[PDB]
Amino acid sequence: GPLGSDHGETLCGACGDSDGADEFWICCDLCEKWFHGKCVKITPARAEHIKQYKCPSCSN
C-alpha cells in the first residue's frame, strides 16, 4: 500500500479510508460526511429513491 496521502482526499465516515476507483459514494445532508455505499450498505439503485441522506450518527 502507498505511503502518505492525497491532501485533496475525502475520507469515508465509516472505515476512514480514501476514495478509490469505481466506487459508489453518498453524502449525509446534515453533517456533510461522505461514505462508501458498501460501508453504509446502500446501492446506487437504492440511493435513487433517497431524497436527503441522513447518516446513522445524525439519525439519533
Binding site: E23, D29, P44
Partner: peptide
C-alpha cells in the same frame, strides 16, 4: 441524495 460514482483506472 448527494451521491457520486468515481471513475475507473
Amino acid at each position: 441524495a448527494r451521491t457520486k460514482q468515481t471513475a475507473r483506472k
